[PDB]
Design a protein around this ligand. Structure first.
Ligand SMILES: O=C1N[C@H](c2c(CNCCCCCCNCc3[nH]c4ccccc4c3[C@H]3NC(=O)c4ccc(O)cc43)[nH]c3ccccc23)c2cc(O)ccc21
Ligand SMILES: O=C1N[C@H](c2c(CNCCCCCCNCc3[nH]c4ccccc4c3[C@H]3NC(=O)c4ccc(O)cc43)[nH]c3ccccc23)c2cc(O)ccc21
Ligand SMILES: Nc1nc2c(ncn2[C@@H]2O[C@H](COP(=O)(O)OP(=O)(O)O)[C@@H](O)[C@H]2O)c(=O)[nH]1
Ligand SMILES: Nc1nc2c(ncn2[C@@H]2O[C@H](COP(=O)(O)OP(=O)(O)O)[C@@H](O)[C@H]2O)c(=O)[nH]1
Ligand SMILES: Nc1nc2c(ncn2[C@@H]2O[C@H](COP(=O)(O)OP(=O)(O)O)[C@@H](O)[C@H]2O)c(=O)[nH]1
Ligand SMILES: [Mg+2]
Ligand SMILES: [Mg+2]
Ligand SMILES: [Mg+2]
Lengths: 163, 160, 164
């Protein structure tokens, strides 16, 4: 069975752990220690092909470069009520591009917390950024699970197209 | 013995030759003809490993960019234009070597002078956007000179 | 933690499963279903560096085979010292791995298993000569006594580290 290493990145508090555990366990965690960096496996079917997801939920330089080199695709998560988290995204894109020395790393832009009313990042703004990178943009709520499968499955499709 | 081809680039007058000759000879040259482009060797020990530095002191540029393994991008701290040239060097090297991760060090030379026009924070932010180190040097006093070249070698080593 | 994907290949009955379970569990299995192809993880320290071994114990010996050869980073090529045919198979495994990975220098270790049995038909010198012709190490093992088992897998990890 084919296996894909996916890395979830983004600023503190955006929902990386909540998204990861929703995908892996169909479980919503309200309180997850922000210092724990762990990986999880799940077997899924995407477009009729069974594969194993190996998902790194990043927390906090040498160690960072290492998991960027072995990761095959990246979920770049911001929170739609936190403009700083959205303005940080380009730093993640730039680091990944440099560490993997590639202009075409499989990546998906994720706008999390879409269930909340206090939106400060426009959808159009995130769509425009994703379009400048030529990557998909998916809005998620780890709380309701809306868009969660979409974000990870779309990342796998990006890896498959790249190969 | 492993050898490393290093290329010193930067605007006229920033101190490329003075830095190169301080590294190679432990000698400060006050003048040095600005038209002379030459290479120099020196055997050094870095992190317990003996290696040969092959350093090109620049005045096709494409040829030596392709051959060079790491680049010292030098500006002078009292010359704002030389700092504004830095991004042009980075973009050329990136294109010619076709890589987003070329071993590079940003060098702010002439740190002994008082007439500073480029802020340390400004150069630090630029290096940080490139993911490369920033080292302030004085080829006149030799402060930071070994640090700049040795750090560049360490960048090459990590890359491989 | 760095992770290494290692693949154990060789003819039916040479001891691939017995070797893998000795490494992972410190346990000798006298009978293990020859049809089961599975992978196992173990965290080990080699030369002061902690790493995760992810070891595929191959059973059937085309498309899935090509897949795990492309994914595997290093290969234990196992024969049994009382089975000349299994030794004559080795060059076929080497040629397949070379083709599938498109590389003349794939990390590999030649393993001569069952060194505890008396009915040897493959000479140590014969195996050393073959390994020398490939530029890879040769390690004699017994999955029964566990002699050489750590050596075979650790040496393969060292080959991967040197290749990188
Ligand atoms: O694609 C195939 N995979 C197969 C296979 C397996 C099974 N694998 C099961 C997962 C095991 C996860 C182990 C924790 N993996 C942990 C994990 N998950 C991540 C997710 C993203 C990024 C990094 C990681 C890591 C980290 N790994 C690093 O090196 C690292 C560095 C710094 C970090 O900080 C984090 C990490 N074992 C094999 C051994 C040989 C050949 C093939 C295989 C297989 C068989 C087959 O017939 C056909 C195809 C395939
Ligand atoms: O790593 C090893 N090196 C070893 C070795 C040597 C020694 N070499 C030392 C002389 C150094 C040349 C001095 C000109 N080198 C001149 C020089 N220095 C530079 C620095 C940066 C960029 C370019 C250059 C150049 C230029 N070369 C170009 O193509 C070019 C284009 C445009 C320009 O304008 C400038 C240049 N000779 C060998 C022959 C075969 C195999 C190995 C070697 C060795 C032996 C060994 O047992 C184990 C390991 C190694
Ligand atoms: N309302 C809402 N809250 C969320 C969502 N995702 C995460 N959270 C909350 O935001 C906080 C930070 O989540 P966490 O998973 O720890 O974020 P991390 O630091 O990126 O790992 C936690 O209180 C979560 O319960 C979401 O989609 N909607
Ligand atoms: N005060 C001071 N002067 C320097 C330093 N480095 C170079 N210079 C002087 O600046 C001028 C240009 O130096 P040079 O090495 O020829 O620059 P290049 O054109 O980049 O090769 C010379 O007069 C040098 O003596 C330094 O660190 N401090
Ligand atoms: N005496 C001895 N028997 C072994 C050794 N390794 C494996 N065996 C036995 O040889 C048979 C085949 O082993 P197995 O692990 O199933 O081989 P595989 O088909 O390559 O996976 C089993 O009966 C094992 O107990 C060894 O080093 N010494
Ligand atoms: Mg977290
Ligand atoms: Mg000069
Ligand atoms: Mg078996």
């Amino acid at each position: 069975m084919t296996e894909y290493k996916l890395v979830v990145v983004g600023a503190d508090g955006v929902g990386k752990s909540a998204l990861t555990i929703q995908l892996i366990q169909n479980h919503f965690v309200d309180e997850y220690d922000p210092t724990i960096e762990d990986s999880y496996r799940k077997q899924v079917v995407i477009d009729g092909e069974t594969c194993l997801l190996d998902i790194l939920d990043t927390a906090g330089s040498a160690m960072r470069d290492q998991y960027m080199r072995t990761g095959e695709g990246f979920l770049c998560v911001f929170a739609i009520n936190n403009t700083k988290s959205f303005e940080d995204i380009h730093h993640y894109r730039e680091q990944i591009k440099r560490v993997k020395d590639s202009e075409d790393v499989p990546m998906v832009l994720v706008g999390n917390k879409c269930d909340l009313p206090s939106r400060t990042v426009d959808t159009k703004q995130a769509q425009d950024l994703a379009r400048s990178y030529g990557i998909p943009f998916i809005e998620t709520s780890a709380k309701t699970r809306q868009g969660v499968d979409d974000a990870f499955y779309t990342l796998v499709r990006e890896i498959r197209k790249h190969k």
